[model samples]
Each structure stands twice: as structure tokens, then as C-alpha cells.
Target chain A: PQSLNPKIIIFEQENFQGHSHELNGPCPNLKETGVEKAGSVLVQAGPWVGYEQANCKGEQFVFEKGEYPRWDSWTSSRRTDSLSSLRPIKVDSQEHKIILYENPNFTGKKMEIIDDDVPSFHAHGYQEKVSSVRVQSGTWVGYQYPGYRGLQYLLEKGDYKDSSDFGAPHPQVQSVRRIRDMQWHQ
Target chain B: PQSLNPKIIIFEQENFQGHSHELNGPCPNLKETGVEKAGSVLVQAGPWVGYEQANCKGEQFVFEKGEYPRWDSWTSSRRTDSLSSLRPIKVDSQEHKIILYENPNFTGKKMEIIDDDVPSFHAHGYQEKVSSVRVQSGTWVGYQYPGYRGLQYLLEKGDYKDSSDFGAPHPQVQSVRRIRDMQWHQR
Candidate 1:
């Protein structure tokens, strides 16, 4: 069992200086959090996955429990504050549940899933029109195409209240599965 | 936020074709589970960490929810059916507590700790004489020397029962700390 209470603060300048935005959960668009780019970050507690584009698309980077004085600390490209979306990495959590909506802001047609491996959204009446999603628990892998293939997004325990939260390119998610990593006790 | 129910079956032969040891929790020694080596593994529902030596030591291999027809499927050395200790990894749950005992099987002088780091064991009257331990909750890092240095063993949520369970080479633990990773939600 892993805790999903991750906290992170993004800064607009290097060495954690300048405009800052603190986050305790996933945010699909940095613009929504009042920042356009992050030059540095202070991971007070996390295993966060950052995407270059909103809705969590483009190049991705995983941030652990540490401090990144600059963008170069997390990426070789040296892109600062340009984060569009981010979510925590849930390495050990067994609750696999998700809810999809036809409209953004968590409204409209709704669909819920509690197990791994959903092959087709069309079969479930949701299909290529998921405007928002809510990950109740656990880490899930969402695919752009059915049969568990195509553009993959590692969705952790959070809320993607809109399509841009995952940068789906379109409001369509065809399939989903849980990412089951190893666990150990001694 | 996560469940700790993990089940793993270790096979005596490749392709999961021999005697198997199905484990639902932590096992200090596989001999206690009836299987000596794990040539292959079928992780039905888990995030299990397998050890090469008993008491959870030696090379550690993390097995997710999958099936390894052979040990090589999970390792490059191809060491088959040679696992001696195994346990499920606990990534969440905020209970950080532990108990130290002066004698084996949780007997003799007792010491309890919770939510804090102990820099030295002698300060608490329980020096290098810890013969056994009981992990109440959370993953703890035990150090052989003071100041969180020297040999280190990760003690997860379970009953260590004995000092050997930590593979400490000796029955001495000087320091301990909780392993705090990170977390997040959607906002």
C-alpha cells in the first residue's frame, strides 16, 4: 500500500526563485494553476510525473523526493516552467477505479470502472468522447486505441476534470489498465 | 489508499511446472513455506520483492503483477529457484512504528518507537543487543551504526520476530528512520 499525498511547488526562476505554484494533486494545465512554465521545482514529497504539454502529453519526466534547482536537473533539453500537466506516481496501491464523463468539469454522461483491462469505450457507450476523467484510486494506463495499445498515459490517483489534463490530442480514450509494479516487506 | 493483499507462487521448475510455494504475506525464509528455490514465479496480484538469501537479503528482485516462466525472465544472471526470502512492498500507509527486543522471539528488554528517527541506540538503553524486532507499520531503514550509517536493511510492515530477519550480520541495530517517498492527487 502506498500513500498518494504528494506535494510539489514549481518556480518560474532557477534555484527555486520567482513566481511559484504549489500543488498537492494532479493538474492537467499549468495555466489553470496560474503559471505558464517552471524553471525549477521543490519536491517536498513526491514521485511526480511531469508532461511538456497540458493534459499530460509530450516529453515526460518523473520527479522523486528532492529538489531540482533548474529544469536541466530533470531534463536534458533545459525546458523550464513549460509544464502543462503532472501527476504523482503510485507505485503501490490496489484500488483500481476510474470514472469518465462526456463533458468537462465532471458533468454529462458518466461511466465507472473498478477493474483492470477495459478493451473498448464504444462497447461501454463512452467511446472517443471522454471530456473528463476521475481516477478514484491506484495507477492506471490509458490508451488512445482499444486492445490496450497506442498513446499511453500513466494516470495515478487524481482527477482529470477535462480532456486537456491528459493531452489526449482528442477527447477520446479507448482502453485502460492498471500498472502493477512490485512491492516488498521485510 | 492501497491494499496489501499480495499472492505469489514460486515454482521449483521452469515454466511453472513443479512444486510451488504460494505466499500471501512476508516469509523470512522460503523453507518455512515448503519451497527452497524459485525457478519460476507467477505473480497473481502483487508488487513482491524476492531476495536471494534468507531473512530478506542478497540481491533483491522486484516482481510486479506478471508471470515469469523462469528466473531468467526477471534476472540477467539466470539464477533459478534460488530465492530464500520474499515480501510485499508497502508504498503507502503512514503508520511508522517499531519495537526492539533484547532477546529472541520478542522477549527480554523492550523498546518502542513511533514517527521519529533514533540517532543512537545507546541513548535509548538498547545498544547493539537487539536480538529480535517487530515492525508495527511503515517501511523503516535500520542502520548498523549510529547516525543512520553503516550496513542498512529496509524493514517493511510485518513481524521481523528476530534480528536475523534484517540480515544484519549481527544482532545489533543502532538507528532507524521511516522511508517517506512522495505523493499527489488531482486538483
Candidate 2:
């Protein structure tokens, strides 16, 4: 077995055919392997997340879809969001820390989280729109709507100047979490 | 905690009002109390799968909303079917291993799984169809279509000798999960 077996694989054809690559870490700009428009996928190992937008090279979290054979397998027919990128995820062994801001440029009410996963900002009364973010250490992922529903966002160990910076079409970043071994949310 | 904490509670009035009962097990028929039809429900704890008829039959409704302001919030869209019976679901702990068989009675090509989930056996070069199942351990649920969509079949911890044994109205189950917690399977 290879030292780092890829947990996720994307096939270019709907029935697991065509251009494909085994991903061990972040494989941004999937266009590099004709995966930019590939729809079928297989999660052969652990769980990993995908994104609708591409070339984040920095990792975009969302859609932890497993065994996705077609785009319909993971998305709705109402919109035309392409599954553009996917990445291998892991829980950083270091202390977790991040901050969410209600206003862009890190202003307005802020909530600090460490070594935990928050599934609903609304449930926590931090329902204020999350316009900016600061990942002080561990990598993190988030969702556009509460209950961890809607578009996903990847927050690496860095800063997001605005909600758009996290790849959301609008603000409502209702939840966030550190990349677990990508375990089941249950 | 309330002394008799109900796994599921149905109210005659919306917002969980009026006549109420704290039920812990399957109510093959809810009229046993005054809940032939309810306004809202609160499932404080569940794998409570509801059906539109008694004896665990008819339109299946998987309740995950946990709280429905109006019972309509717990429906499958376009069904006046009454919430007749509800059964509780309990999936025991880890070591997930549920196998799939191409033919019924644990015969004709099979795959052994110690853990992990598969979206489609078709993707694994096996497109015959899941005609039978064996829940050696752990709890599982299979989807009529892969990528976790379509009719959901609950396979607790037991044996489903054949398709009908799993209540699989279809000829095939494209995908299966071990009580996922989807983390946004759209993750």
C-alpha cells in the first residue's frame, strides 16, 4: 500500500470512468486532471468534503458526500453549482482555535471557539451574520445555513476578510467546525 | 428530566398543545390515547420512524426535525396520510459491519465489511442488485438509490434474508450507511 492512501477519488464519467486521481491531501484546481467537471466520485477510505467553487489551493470545505456517483447524488436540481474541488481532511493534533465576526474586517460581535464543533450558530444565539473569520490554528469548515445545511466554506489557518471570501454566495455562515478525522456528525 | 420522559410526544393542538401522551415504545395505533391525529410533536429522543398507518405500514416518515411546530413539517410532501403509528429506532454502538449479497439467502456473491460505508456497490464493479442482507453487527440503513437518496430502509441489528425482509420494495438498494450523523453528506 502507498504510504498515504487516498480516501477520495473522483471519476470523470458518471459510471466511474475517465480521468481520475487518488487524493491524499488538498488537490485544488481539479481542472489540472479533467476533474474540474467530473461528477462521479467514490469515498473509498475515510470521509472528505468537496466544494462547488475551485482553485482555493487553500482547501474549501463542504459536501462531505460519500459514494457520489453523479452530481445529483450530492446536490439539488434547483441550481447549477458544479462540484469543483475535493480534499482529504484530518483533525489537526494541535489545539483548535478560531473566531467568527459579525462584520467584515473582523469587527462587530465575535465568538471564539477552541477544540470543538459548533453545529448551529443560531442555536447558540450567535445568529448574527458571520461576515468574517480568523482561523488562529487548526483548520476548519463551515456551512452557509444553520443545522450545517447549505453551501460549505473552508477556513484554513488564516483569515477571511468577508463572507464572500469563504466562497458563500451570501452571508449566513451559521455553523463551523475543525476538520475531524472527518468522523460522522452523529 | 421528566419522570416519564417520552421518546416521542404527540399533541392534539399545534405547538404541542392539548391532549398529550408520553410514549416510550411503538404505538401500533396512536388512538390508544387521544392521538389519532396530532398538531405538533416533540421527539426529545428518537430514531422514531413514523408511518401513516398502523402495524408499521404505509407511507414511511423519518422524523429528524426532532420538533415540528406543526406536524406538517414532518411529512414527505403531498400526503394527507395520518400519522397512525410510530416505532422507535435504537442503533447500538460501533464496529460497523453489514454485508451485501447479490442474491437472497446470503448466497451468490457477497462482500464483507468490518466498517465504513459504501455509496454504491455498482461503483465497485457490482451492479447486479442487493437482494439480501446480513447485519452481523452494528446498525444500518440502506437507500433505494445511491448517494443516500430515495426510500430509506432501516436494518437494525438483525438479518434481512431477502429484499422483502428488508421492506425493500425495490429490486435494488444502491447505497447504505451505518447510522451516519450526513455531517452534510452534501459534506
Candidate 3:
């Protein structure tokens, strides 16, 4: 039979336990370095989670709880390495906002947050504040992934405006394609 | 006259300039192993200028912008080593607030954020609703660094509170002392 599907490796153990982020290697500029190193995801729906991560560079060490895992402790040589991937989220809608999140339980260890256009492809409201900033806000919407399909929503509804005014502490997603680069570019 | 104060090194070419932050060192949990470096100062301030400083690891890094004959970097770091000698400001008296001015020709930096404590500090009618948490307010007070002879006032107050129910993120003050110890306690 012709191989319609590509060779996918699923290491099935006798008693497979302990869930973890499946991604490997360094996530260039993506938050959590796209490494997904946390007890729980900073932003989560079902299995998928969005994180705020960085490399050893002290430059992009945002949302850190302790002092050791900081820029200085970061390999200075990797200073040029990809830093944080916490890009500014925005969309063309009524909400017009951006979001960045962190898991309180995990502190700086993990972060999961939502964007204005959360649960991508599913449009619930024509004009709603689905777009938000800060994972701890409690106002952020919920979604699912894989089975539920974790939706990568937008951070803004209309032309995004940085109302919170955290300043350009890190890079931001300037366009929808930029969002694609950050989230789906993998 | 003994040798010039090793601690007090002055740059005669310039008055004051750049971003300044406290140094960051290794955590105490893991030691007798590979040593980590101290935190680097992020930014600093210059004469006729003020900075919004956050104290991490007993060091104060004041952030400011400048226009100079030298390098025109947006931010730099200076070690406020005299922070320990500096005293903790107390919230006392009726007018317990101070005024911190914003950069006039502001080049897109941290603006005049009424840090959850300014408006109510000025409101003559002392209502409970005018609290610093909800409406973002606090007692008016003055902050002075006797060591550096640098004194500034904030119009509002800021505090750290844990709120349940809605579980919103409330602003809080991270003890500078704790940040200091976290910097270099080779334990």
C-alpha cells in the first residue's frame, strides 16, 4: 500500500504516565522558548499551552519569580541567542487589545495566557472583549486543543492599541502574519 | 587626607546619566558548585532628572533617559550601593504622600502612572471607597535617601494585597532587602 501518511513515531509505553510538553530544541524568540517548562501551562485549553519563555540571555528574561533564573545567570554568550517570544497580540475587532500571561502557581517557571482572538477560527461574538492582556486577569476566555483544538486567538479586535502601557519590554506581533509566525510558524 | 573614597567614584565629564539597576547574582539554593554572576544595573538618572526605580537584591536601579555629548543610549545601569544605609520610608501623618514628577520632554518612557495611591491621597473627603486598592490611591508622603541626600515625594501610595474571589492581580511592593539577599547569599 502507498504511504498516504508520513511516518509518525508514537512511543507507546506499557504504562505511559506523566504528561509533558512534546516540543524539543530551543524555541527561537517564542515565550517559554516554546520549551513549555512549567508544572502547568501558563495559557491552556486542553493539551495545548502558550508560554512566556526565554533563553540564557538576560535580555528577554520577562515574568521571572526568582533571581537565579535571570539574565545575569543566563549564559551571556547566549545573550545574542533568541530571548523571549512574548509577542504583542492583536486583531481587527472591537476589543482592540494585547495580552501576556504567567502561571501564578508556577510563578516564573511557567506561563499560559490568551489573546483577544482566542480559540482561533471560532467567532462567538461580533463585538466582545474576548481580546485581553495578562493571564491572571480572570476575564480571559477559555478553549480547547488537539481534541478540542486549542485555538490561537488574536490579542486585539480592531487595530491593536497598547492600553496597558508596559512599553516595548519585548517584541510584539505587528500583524496577523506575525501571529502566524509566532504561533503556527512551527 | 586618607585615600579618596574608593566607593565614591565621580565622572567629572558628566553630571549624572543613564539607566541603573542592581546586580543579579546566583540563587542560594545551589552552591559549592558553579558560581553565578551578580545582577547588572539596567538604567540610571542624571542631574535635573528623576527615575522610576525598582529595587532587586538590595540594589536600586533608577531608569532615566538623556541627551549628551557621549553615547546617546536609551538606558544604562548604576549601582546604588548606598541603598542599605537608606531607610525605609514610613507611612505616617495626615499628608503622607509625595509627588514624583514625570520627564517633561518625555521620550516615550514610563509616564506619570498614578501608582494606585495618588488621587485619594489628595482627595480631602476621606471615604473608604477612595482606597488605594480599588480606585488606585494611597497616603501622600515624601521619600528621601539621607545617604545620597536625594529626596523626592510621591503624590500617592502603593501597597501589596492578596485578593480572593475574583483573584485579580493587585500591585505590591517587593521588599528591596529580600531582593538584595537573593542577589548574593552563597548558602
Candidate 4:
């Protein structure tokens, strides 16, 4: 157990050889620390997002707790030296609130979700019939496919009167997960 | 056993208990077939890509051979009914030719790659030092990381004089895989 403070160590060479920088929070620019590239990484705990450009721009990759022996382990064929910024994905672990609607414009069967994962909409008699949504707290990701597979929409705390408002393209969301903040309290 | 021909069936409800459509190839718009929303799907053979919007826009999902009793089985929380277009992923499966250069502007340590995955640049004595590239045949994807993981660049048959030319963002490529086309030969 590396404590509850999510930690990540980035290396400058393969097989954890060379310079290293341990990060606990967001670093908008790794160059500020005189580290030009990350050849490998070790995520002690929590989810992390790395960017290719400074200030968190360009392509990005999501990492969970684990040892990445090489940058290619996460990036496929892209360059490891391209990593310029990174940050810990923060979410509210205490609770998540959301409202699922059966019709567009918030005019149908409504269900307020406080916490937990919903495998289907059958519980609300709205199975495969969700048309709109509303997120009041925490960042939630809505999946078009069940089990959190397929297309996904990142819904922050806001109002989605229609499915398209969240770029859903369709009125069906089969599952949802709240993004939790760093696990600082274990 | 199913043939190599790519075939897929979309269902309107879970457990394959609703309307259905059989597809053999690319359907730019699933709505045209009256399948406005697909609740489940069955992939008979080959890999397929599904889109969330018409004309193959919005989100996309890759499905291989299997039975997706519910859209949730593949999409998690998103709606499978949102699927508006689909097509079989077809790979040439015939040939792949590429040229890896150690120096920029094709100046040093040249190696011709005909086919196969290279796990490291060290094998070519060019460890993480690829500067230029040239794809002569078939579509290929270049990964900056080994084992074909990490960021990837799609390179069609052409010339990538430098790493940036193919959107490498960096000059090192650890692995490569040829892209397959939609399964149309069997259809």
C-alpha cells in the first residue's frame, strides 16, 4: 500500500533506467522539472491522464495503478518523449447524483441516481429507452453499450435536456460510472 | 464454424428477442434498413466497426465474432440504438511493405520490412532512433510503444519522410501492424 495519495513515477529511459519524477498531483508541464520525456511510468494507485503536449493538450492516455515498463506499453506506436503533461483524475468518491429521463426535454419517466451502477433501465420501466439526462454532481461517463463498453460521453455537473446535448447521438445509455477524486483517504 | 465472410445481425431488444437485420458489408446508415436502434448484435465472423451516428460519425465500437445479447454487453452505458452505421473491418491480409530509416531525411541505417511485428528497434541496432519511414504497400499502424501499445499513427501506402510526417509526434516507433479492410471478398 503506497498510502492513499495516488502517486506516479515517470522515467526517462526504458526498463525504469535513467531520470525519474514522482508526481502526486497535476503537472501541466513536465519540462518545468527539467524532464523532457517519459520513457516508462509506474502508477502506484488511482487513475491518471497523460498528455502529449504541454498544458494538457494533444493526445492523452488514461492510466490506472500499475507499472508501465515502457511508454509503448500504453501508447502503442506513438513516441514516449511526446508526453509533456499529466494530472490525476479527480472525482467525488463520497457520492454521485444524476437524473435519467425517458424522453427528450425532461418530459418522461425520471429516475434520480445517487450512487451505484445501473445495468439496465428496466428497473424504471425505461429499459433501452433513455432519451435525456441531467448531471448535478460529480463527473459521470455514460456508455452507449452495456458494461461500460463502446461509445462514451463525459457528463460533468450540468443539465442535459436532450441526449444530443451530451453528444449522445442517440437516446440510449445502458450504464454509468462516476469519476472519483484521488483516493487520499483510502 | 462460420466462414471467413463477415456477417453481423443487429437486434432491437436484449436476448435477441426483437427486430433484426443481417449485414454483409458497410452500412453507411443503419436507419435506411429500418434499424434505427440496435439493442443487441451477433457477429458471425470477422471484425466490425459500429458507429453512433448516421454516415459513420459520432462514437465507434469494434466488434469481433461473438454474441452480444445486449447492447450493454458492448457499450456499457451508452445506447446501442444510437448505432446508425456499420461496416466490416477488412484487412488486406496479403502483403505489407515498409522502410524504416535510422536518420532523418532517409540518411542512415535503412531496413526494409516486408511483413511481421518488430518488438524493438534494438533488433535493427536503431534502438528508439527511427527518424523517417516509407510505407509502400497496404495500410499500416505505427505504435510509439512496444507490443503495439500506446499512441498509434495510421499510415496508408505512402511516404512519411519524417516521424512528424505521419503524425508520430516523436521519431521512435516500437511496433507496427497492418490494417485489415472490411470483409468484402466473401460477400
Which residue runs of candidate 1 sit more than 4 Å off their true CA positions? A1-94, A183-186, B1-187
Lowest lDDT 10-mer window, candidate 4 chain B? Answer: B178-187
lDDT of 3 by residue, B1-187 (tens): 1221111111212333333222222112211222121122122221111122222122222212223322123123233222221111111111122222212221111212232233222232221111122112332222122221122122223331221111112212111000000111111
Model 3 lDDT tens row, A1-186: 332111111111112222433332233344332332232222111111112244322222222122222222322224232333332111111112233322222222222332333443223222222222342222222222312222222222222133122222222222221121110100
Give the per-residue lDDT of model 4 (tens digit) for A79-180. 444888888655212235788888988777887777566655555455746787887766566777677765666666768888887767678787776554
lDDT of 4 at B33: 80
> Worst 10-residue stretch by lDDT in candidate 1 chain B?
B178-187
CAPRI accuracy category, model 3: incorrect
**Highest-scoring model, TM-score:** 1
Ranking by lDDT: 1, 4, 2, 3
TM-score of chain A of 4: 0.48
Q: How much of the real interface does each model capture, measured as fnat?
A: 0.18, 0.00, 0.00, 0.10
User: For residues B37-124, could you state the per-residue lDDT of candidate 2 as single tens digits?
Assistant: 7788887766466766677664555554268868667653435547888866432222456888989888888876655777887777
Q: Write the per-residue lDDT of candidate 2 for residues A39-138, one digit (tens) a residue.
A: 6877765445565567532212233435677867655432444666666444211246889999999999998988678988877789788888988876
Please write out the lDDT profile of model 1 over residues A38-154, one tens digit for every residue.
Answer: 888888777677876788665556677788998777754344446789876544223357888889998998888875568887787765488888887655667778896555454
CAPRI quality of model 1:
incorrect
Residue A186 lDDT in candidate 4: 9
Global fold similarity of model 3 (TM-score): 0.14
Candidate 1's interface RMSD, please?
20.3
- Return the TM-score for each candidate structure: 0.29, 0.27, 0.14, 0.28
- Residue A164 shift from truth in candidate 2, angstroms: 44
The DockQ of predicted model 3 stands at 0.01
